[PDB]
Amino acid sequence: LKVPPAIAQFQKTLDKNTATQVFKLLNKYRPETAAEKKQRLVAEAEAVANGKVSKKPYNVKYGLNHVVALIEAKKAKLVLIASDVDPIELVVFLPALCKKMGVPYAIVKNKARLGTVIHQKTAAVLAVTEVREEDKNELASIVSAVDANFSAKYDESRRKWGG
Amino acid sequence: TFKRAETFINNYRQRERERIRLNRSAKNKGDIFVPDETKLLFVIRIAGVKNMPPKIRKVLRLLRLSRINNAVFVRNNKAVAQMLRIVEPYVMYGIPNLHSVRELIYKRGFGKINGQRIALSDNALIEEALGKYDVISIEDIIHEIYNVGSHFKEVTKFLWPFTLTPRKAGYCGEEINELIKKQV
Amino acid sequence: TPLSSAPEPKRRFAPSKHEQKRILQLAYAIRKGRILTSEQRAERER
Amino acid sequence: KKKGVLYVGRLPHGFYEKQMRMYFSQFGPVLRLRMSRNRKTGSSKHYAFIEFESLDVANVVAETMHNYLLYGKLLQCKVIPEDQVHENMFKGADVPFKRIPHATIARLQHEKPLSKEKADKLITRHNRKLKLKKRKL
Amino acid sequence: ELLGSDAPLEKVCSALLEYESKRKSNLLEDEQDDIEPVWLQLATLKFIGNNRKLIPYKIAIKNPVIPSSSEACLIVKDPQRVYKDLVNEAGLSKVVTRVIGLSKLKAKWNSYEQKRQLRDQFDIFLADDRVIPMLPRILGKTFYQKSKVPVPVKISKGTAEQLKREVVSAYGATYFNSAPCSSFMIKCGHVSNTSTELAENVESILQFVSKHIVPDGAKGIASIHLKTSQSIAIPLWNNPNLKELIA
RNA sequence: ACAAUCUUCUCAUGAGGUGUUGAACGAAAAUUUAAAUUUAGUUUGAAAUCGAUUGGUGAAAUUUUACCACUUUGU
């Protein structure tokens, strides 16, 4: 058949170098594991039991409903969509929603790579909303690359029927 | 394989980093640390990074570190310190305790007689090659190397760059024995 | 502009009450000895 | 067939003539390599002109290596058409930049005493410099 | 006197100030207390510096050149909280706007855009002696070329009255970056200061110059001139016996 | 391997600390000996379409230094 433009736009993913750079920044903001989080809580629990303030965390945002609500909140600075969601309808609107709400987005390879970042088997989509001040330049540099290598590229190919 | 552009820049940054440290430590910082507690060390090579500064390249060769992990009996004094400090980012220097040198000589001892790895298994080999050097056995080799005897330089030449394949880029002291214990 | 005009809750500007609930019930087990403390567990591994 | 000249801009610091030559050689032959360098200290002006043996391969490198996120810099690799290419656009290509230490050379000049007559010429010149301000004030 | 028994101070400062004042010829939202600086250029018979020493010279003088209303930024070693507490109890918060730890300066300010933003924010950058060798990097030409050289202010012990004495010392003392040359220029003050202070600020500079930068002192000094950014370099003193010194 | 050693001070009481993206605009002074340095200043995206300074020094085996800088390149 002839793939519609909204479904063909997923075949033109993000390239080697930019994806590797994107995942390098994501891996500095991975969420905290279930095994580690318990250790952090029992450390704080033991501190309060013997005798007795912290800072807000900084981790990448995941979850389809959570991220879509972050795009519509104009909070997400970068949205990374898996290219192989089994029901494609789950993300078929995400590129158009990101275009409408002025968010930089990219379609990257494999849900597992996004899944690995957040200690899950699979992640449909990932969003970066806030980064540490030390890495504001790195996120800004990556977003520029996504604009140049994903949004500036293709562009016309996402409006043409695929296949 | 296809080398990516970042590797070439990474080589330049390390080179400039390597060049800088060499310029500071050598020129206007002629002061040296002068390692002590022995007259003999067991310097090993951590990793000679590719495209060394041309100064570096012989410092491995002359003090016998041409290959990685090459543990050698070097006469511990002020003279080796500046040269070692030239190559200190790629080496670990440490003291060959008598047990470590004996254990190395007993099993891993492959003395570079005629430039080839000649095993120190037979005490006659030490006795015959180092008869004028007073080293007569593997135990006498430790006396001539670990205790740095009168002919330690000749014994070291008789000895080999023992590849103590496993490390900090500097002082080890007894830690060379720790690597030797695992290596041998 | 954002899509929702719902006011921001205070909870997002404060330390989480989820872990505060979890910390308090971890403390209770530490007090009652149900949970081996980090020092006791670490020294038990030796 | 016709030489394919590649303008590589926004060069990350370190990606210099030797480094460009090894990297760009994998795509295709680089007849000669020229990077713009500063007037005095010869520091990179971050854009180089890389003419390949043929336009075709240079087009491949231009496509492959455009907007390359390198060391936090978006690399700009454009095939410059020959019409804007001039005779000395690749002048002194693959020729080492012997940075002349102008500052120390004048320091050696400072260390070098003038000839006694030429030193007296300086003293009179300072006297000229002294009397030039004389009617100046 | 002083240099070669012929330094005509006082009168030269008054004459230069009068000459500058003679050259006098909406902006209410574009006005401040800026006064044209006073410039002292020194000529030496030989290149004093081997290379650019990117630290200022603490030329002590009791007539400040930097106005006391200027904003100062302290660059201190870790932890940042300790010295943030120190400036809090010493009452220097109004004077010293920000205190920046070295790690936070190396991380939060990496782009040149951020570096220039920080540079324009404050006027004088005070730095602890304990970490001043780093500031060559991390800051770069955005600072050491656009007249923003951090000053090594001695705060190692970290006490309230010590902070006050060093900040006052830093504010009052004029500053200059040594570079390899036979000539260099010194900040003496502004047109606002009276001529007597400039002459006395000037003489304090030469005696410091003859001591800690010029090795042979007044013997190696070629000439002394007084200038304003748009004025004539009026010669304070010229060497009367430099003929055989250079021979 | 887009990872590496650019400086928590040092001595001595003084001296040092070896270190700055490029490009554009701009004073007006000095010495050094027009270029050479300093030299009011500046502006900007780690910005980028020729313009090169053009000698020396070694330091390997004359081409090689893409910083080797006169204190001037393989212990």
Residue numbers in the entry:
A (entry chain G): 69 to 120, 125 to 235
B (entry chain t): 50 to 215, 232 to 249
C (entry chain m): 213 to 258
D (entry chain o): 102 to 238
E (entry chain K): 5 to 29, 41 to 262
Text of the article:
Eukaryotic ribosome biogenesis is a complex, tightly regulated process that involves many ribosome biogenesis factors and spans different cellular compartments. Here, we answer these questions and reveal how the nascent 60S moves from chromatin to the late-assembly compartment in the nucleolus of Schizosaccharomyces pombe (S. pombe).
We analyzed the isolated Ytm1-containing nascent 60S by cryo-EM, which revealed 3 major states in both wild-type and fkbp39Δ cells—each state can be further classified into multiple substates. Among other differences, the RNA domain III is flexible in state 1 but stably incorporated in state 2. In wild-type cells, ~20% of particles are in state 1 and 50% in state 2, and in fkbp39Δ cells, the populations are ~65% and 15%, respectively. To gain deeper insight into those biogenesis defects, we characterized state 1 in more detail. In the wild-type dataset, the majority of particles (~85%) had density for Ppp1 and associated proteins (state 1B), whereas in the fkbp39Δ dataset, only ~55% of particles in state 1 exhibited density for those factors. Furthermore, in the wild-type dataset, state 1B showed the N-terminal helices of Ppp1 stably incorporated into the nascent 60S subunit, but those helices were less defined in the nascent subunit isolated from fkbp39Δ cells. Our data indicate that Fkbp39 is required for the stable incorporation of Ppp1 and of the Ytm1-Erb1-Ppp1 complex into nascent 60S particles, which is essential for ITS2 processing and the assembly of the RNA domain III.
